[PDB]
Design a protein around this ligand. Structure first.
Ligand SMILES: CCCCCCCC/C=C/CCCCCCCC(=O)OC[C@@H](O)CO
Ligand SMILES: CCCCCCCC/C=C\CCCCCCCC(=O)OC[C@@H](O)CO
Ligand SMILES: CCCCCCCC/C=C\CCCCCCCC(=O)OC[C@@H](O)CO
Ligand SMILES: CCCCCCCC/C=C\CCCCCCCC(=O)OC[C@@H](O)CO
Ligand SMILES: CCCCCCCC/C=C\CCCCCCCC(=O)OC[C@@H](O)CO
Ligand SMILES: CCCCCCCC/C=C\CCCCCCCC(=O)O
Ligand SMILES: [Zn+2]
Lengths: 108, 121, 285
């Protein structure tokens, strides 16, 4: 139970077209070995951004990963209706791998 | 395309054991580590452990060392996770998630819901 | 250790900025944006282990050879200050080339930006080794004629700086430009044919051969051609794809030809200095 991942905000609701920012803080340096996942209702999670800033195959350019050391960020530019769901950060720098508590994002 | 296909849901009694199947296709099975993830209802994700199909080695998160056991059947390209001495806290969706060199997860199973219920005795 | 754990990956799952040789099928380091992980990976087996250690050991070897060259007794030279500056310029080219080389191969898998930065330094390192090798060579060969010595010193610098400029261009690093890179660095080394013909036209056929330069320069030209041929055609992994992922692939053999080529060049110019010391520092002929 070594590296604690702190996601913020826990939840938020924004309108389509706006920009949101989810932050993650690690209890120890994770050397950019961070990933973000989006999870839809009743569905399995899907990788958005990996290695802190690398945008995964198939993911829109609206998603952008940023940060270093212990402070990472996920920015969703121009929100779309399909962006509702739970967002999770994850560290793969040290075992055991840990996830953030998640961020519930509602779209108005 | 890569696909991770898990076995169907389980509704079991407390103290029972379950084996979650993870059929892996669309790639060379032994090339990547397979990880197991738990998600308790309305909760975040918890890494249970990782498994190396080439070496056969496993690394478990201490929290689940006495609960989960990872096995493999390389010839059939499938990962397994056996859950021991089931309890109401073990009611969760369990996922297999595949690594790509490092433990970020590009590929995920659909999830197996395991329900520990004492409704029938 | 539990930190920065990784497994090798096949070629197909690599990002585009890492897919440079499709005949190295497995054993690749995955993208890992940690200098701690990249430097720790020097102690791991992957496509880049041999590339890293050939030039890591070669780098400490020329550094040790250069320190010992500087502390050689001044009594064993004709002009110890200018002789050590011309050898030192060669050592500076060799050490920088091998340092930029093993650093690039170590931090290559870090990120796209880091790999772009160190590939530009890696390429530039080959131009510095080539320009720097001309300096003691022109020095001893045109020991009596200063004007052609200085003209050739200019030429190799103008050409070398042009290779450093072109090796800054993003298209130059793409796998399709592999033979362009091989031709650019090959032309740079093989441009020594000009001061060679000037030297044999002036000094004589007997004079150039007897003093071992002709044979030694044919060996150097062979290592240049043979080294550029393996590198450009990806031999032998082109013939045995998947068998040369870790040992003896083209880039690995090329790395060996760079440290060997720099050692036969050093041995050559080091004999030229022994000969100059045997005859003294004037002109009677
Ligand atoms: C060129 C002369 C010889 C050089 C010696 C090689 C240096 C030896 C070790 C190098 C690695 C040191 C660790 C370098 C940094 C570790 C990974 C990283 O990027 O973490 C920084 C975080 O704050 C960002 O998330
Ligand atoms: C990976 C290879 C690393 C091994 C070391 C490198 C090989 C040795 C290189 C050169 C040795 C030539 C020795 C002869 C040249 C030095 C002459 C001298 O008088 O030097 C004084 C010294 O006390 C200065 O410290
Ligand atoms: C006394 C004569 C000169 C001797 C000293 C020479 C030392 C080596 C100098 C230069 C080496 C070539 C430098 C070439 C330039 C460095 C790479 C670069 O431009 O990177 C930019 C990045 O943002 C791209 O990602
Ligand atoms: C690392 C740089 C080393 C110096 C530059 C090397 C560039 C290659 C230059 C020339 C090619 C090889 C030598 C070519 C030599 C040309 C003269 C010749 O044909 O002599 C034949 C004799 O039998 C007549 O007596
Ligand atoms: C005197 C000969 C010594 C060997 C010199 C070798 C370097 C020059 C050779 C060829 C230059 C080709 C220029 C054209 C390069 C075309 C690039 C290409 O299509 O590459 C295909 C891949 O399979 C390989 O990258
Ligand atoms: C002292 C001279 C050393 C000569 C030995 C090597 C001969 C090969 C020379 C030039 C061709 C180089 C082509 C490869 C370019 C880039 C390779 C790399 O990134 O390491
Ligand atoms: Zn190299």
């Amino acid at each position: 139970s070594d590296i604690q991942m702190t996601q913020s905000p826990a939840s938020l609701s924004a309108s389509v077209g706006e920009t949101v920012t989810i932050t993650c803080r690690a209890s120890g340096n994770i050397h950019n070995f961070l990933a973000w996942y989006q999870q839809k209702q009743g569905k399995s999670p899907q990788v958005l951004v990996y290695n802190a800033k690398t945008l995964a195959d198939g993911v829109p350019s609206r998603f952008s990963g940023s940060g270093s050391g212990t402070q990472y960020s996920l920015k969703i530019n121009s929100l779309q209706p399909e962006d509702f769901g739970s967002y999770y950060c994850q560290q793969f720098w040290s075992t055991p791998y840990t996830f953030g508590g998640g961020t519930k994002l509602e779209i108005n | 395309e890569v696909l991770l296909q898990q076995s169907g849901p389980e509704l079991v009694k407390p103290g029972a054991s379950v084996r979650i199947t993870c059929k892996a296709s669309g790639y060379t099975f032994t090339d990547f580590n397979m990880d197991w993830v738990k998600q308790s209802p309305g909760k975040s994700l918890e890494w249970i452990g990782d498994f190396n199909p080439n070496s056969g080695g496993s690394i478990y998160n201490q929290k689940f060392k006495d609960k989960a056991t990872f096995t493999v059947d390389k010839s059939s390209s499938t990962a397994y996770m056996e859950l021991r001495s089931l309890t109401f806290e073990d009611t969760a969706v369990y996922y297999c998630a595949r690594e790509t060199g490092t433990a970020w997860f590009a590929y995920w199973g659909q999830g197996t819901l395991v329900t520990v219920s004492a409704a029938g005795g | 250790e539990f930190e920065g754990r990784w497994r090798v990956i096949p070629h197909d799952v690599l990002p585009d900025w890492l897919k440079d040789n499709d005949f190295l099928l497995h054993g690749h380091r995955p993208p890992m944006p940690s200098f701690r992980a990249c430097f720790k990976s020097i102690f791991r087996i992957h496509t880049e282990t041999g590339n890293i250690w050939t030039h890591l050991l070669g780098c400490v070897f020329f550094l040790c050879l250069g320190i010992f060259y500087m502390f050689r007794p001044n009594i064993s030279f004709v002009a110890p200050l200018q002789e050590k500056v011309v050898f030192g310029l060669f050592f500076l080219g060799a050490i920088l080339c091998l340092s930029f080389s093993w650093l690039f191969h170590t931090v290559y898998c870090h990120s796209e930006g880091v790999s772009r930065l160190f590939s530009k330094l890696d390429y530039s390192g080959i131009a510095l080794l080539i320009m720097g090798s001309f300096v003691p060579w022109l020095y001893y060969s045109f020991y009596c004629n200063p004007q052609p010595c200085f003209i050739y010193l200019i030429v190799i610098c103008v050409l070398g700086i042009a290779a450093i400029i072109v090796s800054q261009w993003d298209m130059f690093a793409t796998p399709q430009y592999r033979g362009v890179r091989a031709g650019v660095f090959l032309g740079l080394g093989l441009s020594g044919i000009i001061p060679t013909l000037h030297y044999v036209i002036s000094e004589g056929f007997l004079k150039a051969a007897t003093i071992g330069q002709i044979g030694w320069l044919m060996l150097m030209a062979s290592l240049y051609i043979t080294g550029a041929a393996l590198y450009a055609a990806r031999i032998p992994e082109r013939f045995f794809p998947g068998k040369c992922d870790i040992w003896f692939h083209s880039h690995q053999l090329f790395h060996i030809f760079v440290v060997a080529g720099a050692f036969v060049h050093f041995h050559g110019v080091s004999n030229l200095q022994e000969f100059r010391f045997m005859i003294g520092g004037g002109c009677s002929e």
